[PDB]
Amino acid sequence: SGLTHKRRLSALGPGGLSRERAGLEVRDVHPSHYGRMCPIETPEGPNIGLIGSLSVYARVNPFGFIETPYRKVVDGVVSDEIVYLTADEEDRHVVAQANSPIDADGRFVEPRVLVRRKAGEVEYVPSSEVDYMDVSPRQMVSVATAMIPFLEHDDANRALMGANMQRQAVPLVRSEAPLVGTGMELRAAIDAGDVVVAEESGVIEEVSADYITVMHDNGTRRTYRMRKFARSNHGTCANQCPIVDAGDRVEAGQVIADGPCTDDGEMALGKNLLVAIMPWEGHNYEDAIILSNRLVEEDVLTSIHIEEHEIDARDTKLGAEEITRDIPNISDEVLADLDERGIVRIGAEVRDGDILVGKVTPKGETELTPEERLLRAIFGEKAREVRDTSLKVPHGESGKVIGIRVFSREDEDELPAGVNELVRVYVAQKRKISDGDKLAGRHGNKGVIGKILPVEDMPFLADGTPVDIILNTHGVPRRMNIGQILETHLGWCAHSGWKVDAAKGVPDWAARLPDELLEAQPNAIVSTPVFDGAQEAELQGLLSCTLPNRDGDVLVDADGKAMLFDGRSGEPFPYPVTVGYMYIMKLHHLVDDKIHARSTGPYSMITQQPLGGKAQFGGQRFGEMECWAMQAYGAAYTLQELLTIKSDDTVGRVKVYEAIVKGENIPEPGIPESFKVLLKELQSLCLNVEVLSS
């Protein structure tokens, strides 16, 4: 997400077109975007086509036109000299296609070559008018779209959703590398910048969890610090931990320390989870997902989130605010974790309502009611002339206190005008996976978690291994994203390993397989690039020849399907079920950040309606279409109490609250406040609006 927020070509801004007045002509894919923009990766909201992203190989002219490289082919011989051509020259010439049979020196093989002509048309031109060729396939795609395996089997809408959800993943605590990926993972990690890279070669002298000091080849030494548990912009964690030993030898450019979402150098946004593609008892109905309890027990999908809270003590008119533990009228027991000078001690667990910074503002002397005067005279306390406005941790938050960063005026810090002291408190919590949290794959198959079963009532294999997620099978065929099925099959092959029996020669599916893909150990990481990947025939062969687990037992037969038992009723399932290893990632649409509720909170200023948003308490909006639905039902009293004694009847809200608390009957509503505001505006526009009686 950090990398793809740069390399973004937003078409809207000062000097560009707006959002409401943008025509549908400018939002389309012109045929001159081949290698200068990505047709896939756009935001799927109301910004389709107005925000794109640069291609992988593209550059920028001195003037601002987006170039792209091409190989120059001279008289039917493809050379190696690379010419950067912008869109005008690409329209002038005729450009070949990247996956065409070069004859080992530069010559084409077949006498007719698929090309790309001037007006975006595609023709069949003989192999002598061809004068340019692409550098590689996947020249059109972006960075984020280059990390989807089997992209050419997905549909374009699901590829768009996959490329947009790949940059919403959260950094887990373990960060395991994917079992089947593409090649654009190491480069996209060391170029993102969140990986410490050695500058010059040397030998490691000392590794701690805070620094590595390489001893260079000429005397000098250099110590790289680490960012340990530093908050990011969006509230996640930015931990960095070394991956070298205390005696190693490194070269220049070598990865020396991981990042948030990396594993031994390369990008890793999620975990490998054993999947089944059956429908299971309605808990995975319409894109819901059932997990296992093993992912909560073993802390597989567990992330760390860090908040911050800020209060500041300025000097108001009646005096100066004071940060101290001498709070006005309050119990002693809530002042347990607070230190001698206000702020909480480091390590103290907090909860929604606790005191973070004790600040008390001067109030002065106002009018007191006779009842409170009588109570003060009964119990002997004084007026307590200062008013408590402390900093309290908001609703729903908890977790340890990591650090307190306190500035001050007396240390000559550049606080703004009026602020005498500013203090920031960091509260971090470790969130496990739970129902309501949102998971996703790479090929655009998202979905909330419906139920976390225990580990014993999950469909287990014949060996004894329980599966870990269960994806529904009605969402695969009608959405055209069988990249997930091919990734599942190749994930099982790469997990269990293989050995193609080349005794009586190499078999004819593997005639064009490379060497040392004829055999592989278990947990072998493979890689299929984007538009030049593993074919269906190669997948069928590798599925047919794997190697057994520990005993003589091939758990998955030639179709990719296994004979699952049922962990709840006991009997085996009547038909075999597709299993395999799928790489799913946890998305940042968590259930703890979305839930809010409100009975009575803050109200607005001009009109007396409730506020809106989870940052406040905030009420829900009951608009025109819901009013039409209520009128279509015929509920008049529900509509009247939704529009009067819940929003605007200022003398009615207190009466309905005291009637609910005393247990009485709800009173009849009155005229809402916004209507009287309307009448005052209409009278102020020199119109004589008068309400008659009879």
Partner: peptide, 26 residues
């Protein structure tokens, strides 16, 4: 290859790459 501390990730690719990927922040 071309990055020295790399995990050995075997590829299914059948084409030779003439040009390496540029710097992604240029």
């Amino acid at each position: 290859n071309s990055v020295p501390g790399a995990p050995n990730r075997v590829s299914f690719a059948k084409l030779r790459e003439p040009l390496e990927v540029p710097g992604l922040l240029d």
